[PDB]
Amino acid sequence: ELYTKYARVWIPDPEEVWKSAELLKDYKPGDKVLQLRLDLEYCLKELPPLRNPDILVGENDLTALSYLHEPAVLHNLKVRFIDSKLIYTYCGIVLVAINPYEQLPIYGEDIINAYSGQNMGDMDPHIFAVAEEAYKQMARDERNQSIIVSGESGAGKTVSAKYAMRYFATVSNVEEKVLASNPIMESIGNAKTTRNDNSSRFGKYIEIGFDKRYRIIGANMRTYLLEKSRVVFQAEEERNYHIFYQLCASAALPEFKTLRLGNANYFHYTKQGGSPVIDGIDDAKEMVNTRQACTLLGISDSYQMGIFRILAGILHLGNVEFASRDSDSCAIPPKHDPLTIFCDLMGVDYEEMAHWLCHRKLATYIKPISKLHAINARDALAKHIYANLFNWIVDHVNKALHSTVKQHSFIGVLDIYGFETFEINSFEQFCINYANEKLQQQFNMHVFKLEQEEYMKEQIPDFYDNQPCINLIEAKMGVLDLLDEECKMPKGSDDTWAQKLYNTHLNKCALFEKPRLSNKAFIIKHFADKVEYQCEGFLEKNKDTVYEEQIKVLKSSKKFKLLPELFHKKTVGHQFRNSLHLLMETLNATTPHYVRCIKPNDFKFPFTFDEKRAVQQLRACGVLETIRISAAGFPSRWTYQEFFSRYRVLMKQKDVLSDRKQTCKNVLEKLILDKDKYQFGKTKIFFRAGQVAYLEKIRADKLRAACIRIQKTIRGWLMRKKYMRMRRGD
Amino acid sequence: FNKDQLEEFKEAFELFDRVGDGKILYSQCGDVMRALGQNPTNAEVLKVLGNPKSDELKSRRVDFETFLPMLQAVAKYEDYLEGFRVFDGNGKVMGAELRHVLTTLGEKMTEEEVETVLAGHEDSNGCINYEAFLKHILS
């Protein structure tokens, strides 16, 4: 059929993920093996993916591939990236951006000018094309725009943001103040995880503000989804937010003597991962950068010292140790060094703090609390102070980015993580992946709307809904809700929560599974893949009840103005849910544009495409499932003139009419019998997957036959001539 | 084949013997068939040879008697024209396009093989009258 002699396929390969192979013999039904040439016998009764014909390969948009599957996407991105040094490729509306780990001279004035005023499609894929389309639709639709730059940190999201902004600035010192804030935002929002040395654990939305004449007047940073849990807990080989290590490595600087910092292994809140140092990073040098950037963004030196006082206070706070006392109560040891320092730095009374760290109000008795409750409260306090510090810093960065000129419109650049899947997934990953389900719903709905519109335009008559996954996560009796419920039960644990999950969801929701050999983990079928979460730590990470009296003590401080400036059970998961709902309202009130940044290798190698890494990245960013959805419809879309031009050689002289469109229609209906395989639009033929590939095969077969006939004749002629020469005695 | 034909084919076969043992290489078998008026594809030649491996193709030697059944097996216009009309409708074919297709599709030929046969048949625009070119290589 399609698996004929000559036909090429992709087969699994450990190193390259997939490897090409040609059918060394024709596949017949009933065959258990394919005869392939990498020669080899490939044991099947699912046949391997077909390789696209050469004419479709290396094109600017992946959705023009006829066999639209993972190896075709991998191969196409690879050849563009390696053979043509093209880092940008479209995937329908999605711009895929592969980090070249090389400064490319493709962002200059001359190039900005060539993209300005052009349509989306007439120019080669580029971040500028996306930035232009956003600028263009902003004015045309009188509608705010969002450029959603997804992927892991270091895949090239900051470059994409930089040049979207550089572009808007040109075609219309905003870009440089925004970039100057990067070291600030990375110090307070990024952390070293097991898989990434500098990972943003929050979503950052930079609204580029435009006046009435679409000139850039300034910017506004909004932040979402901050990973609060990290402030007080790190897993193995992970760090807290960078700023804490910047501060600890700066402990001997004279101006910080009063902060009384030890090294990063001194503090409970920075030592848990056993990774004080990131290779290649000088946290003391990054502190210098951070302070310079703080100065560059208008944060006075007193306020900087206040930021650091507060962080130092969080760190000493975390060292406060509770003694268990009679009747499940607790107390703070006399003259406890961590607390004395904390109270000194914050300027609050030692006894008033020590009292409220071990007691709560119940109204009106003064109840002692247990050690576990005191720890949870102390952590919640640390997280609360951090989150409010973080918001303060952001508010004040914003004072520097805001313009006096009134704002008519904006294009917001969202820097957001893609799906995150480690070997061991916990609450942090669950939240990230939840965020990704919500973002994916917006994308899917967007694309489906663009598709309806395209089909309407062409006069042609399937939606993959992820609402069920979202509901499993966020609806009442869902994973997060059950987690909240388990957290407010005094005997609650991870193990009982696990069982509540199984009781509620196992065999009731096909998106939820339980591992065979564990009752302490669950599996969610997310958009891109199944992810297994370990239940351990979910409860404690979720707890976030801040005690009002502890806050009142901080609110009463008379040593520095910054601390009071910062200020049903509250949970991290619910706060994440609320933040994510806030992010989606912000994005849903705009028209989204999508850039997926992928890291092509793990070693910062210039133009180096590791297939295993690339396949993982493409999946995490949603691309492979987006392709699979596109491959289910009519992904191939050719104008009648393109079809006429390419497939003329397939036509008999008889049916070549003056009406070139009608010719295409008559010829196609004889070449491909099943009329369900394509749809005739006004200007374009829409084809199912595989159809264009099939046309290329018969075309290729026609040319191959003609050629062999000619070349065997030529070979005859040449040999008869040689023979005459050798006969004559030459 | 009668005795006279066999004598004529044998004389031709003997011209291809570059070692003096009355034999040719497997790899020469195709050339001798073509020299005797046949136009087998390379695939057809390899089939009558028994689809040999690289090693026996380069070093196995056959006398006339073993060659003969292969020649026999191989031995036992409107399509040719249409075949050229694939690459055309003014009765021409670019020399550049024909060169490309003959060296990159099918049983690919060397550029030198293609240059030899194409010499003198293309005009100043770089076009070959293929009906004329076809008669020539069929002559």
UniProtKB/Swiss-Prot annotation, chain A:
Positions that bind ATP: 151-158
Family: Belongs to the TRAFAC class myosin-kinesin ATPase superfamily. Myosin family.
All residue ranges annotated as the Myosin motor domain in the record: 57-700
Compartments (UniProt record): Golgi apparatus membrane
Assembly mode: May be a homodimer, which associates with multiple calmodulin or myosin light chains.
Tissue spec: Neuronal and non-neuronal cells of the brain.
Protein name, per record: Unconventional myosin-Va
Region (Actin-binding) location: 580-602
Lineage top rank: taxon: Eukaryota
Domain Myosin N-terminal SH3-like: 4-48
Organism: Gallus gallus (Chicken)
Protein purpose: Processive actin-based motor that can move in large steps approximating the 36-nm pseudo-repeat of the actin filament. Can hydrolyze ATP in the presence of actin, which is essential for its function as a motor protein. Involved in melanosome transport. Also mediates the transport of vesicles to the plasma membrane. May also be required for some polarization process involved in dendrite formation.
Domain IQ: 703-725
Swiss-Prot record, chain B:
The EF-hand domain, residue ranges: 4-39, 77-108, 108-139
GO molecular function, one term: calcium ion binding
Keyword Repeat: yes
GO terms classed as biological process: muscle contraction; muscle filament sliding; skeletal muscle tissue development
Gene Ontology, cellular component aspect: cytosol; extracellular exosome; muscle myosin complex; myosin complex; myosin II complex; unconventional myosin complex
Keywords: Motor protein, Muscle protein, Myosin, Repeat
Source domain of life: Eukaryota
Function of the molecule: Regulatory light chain of myosin. Does not bind calcium.
Subunit (UniProt): Myosin is a hexamer of 2 heavy chains and 4 light chains.
Name of protein: Myosin light chain 6B
Species of origin: Homo sapiens
Upper classification of the organism: Eukaryota, Metazoa, Chordata, Craniata, Vertebrata
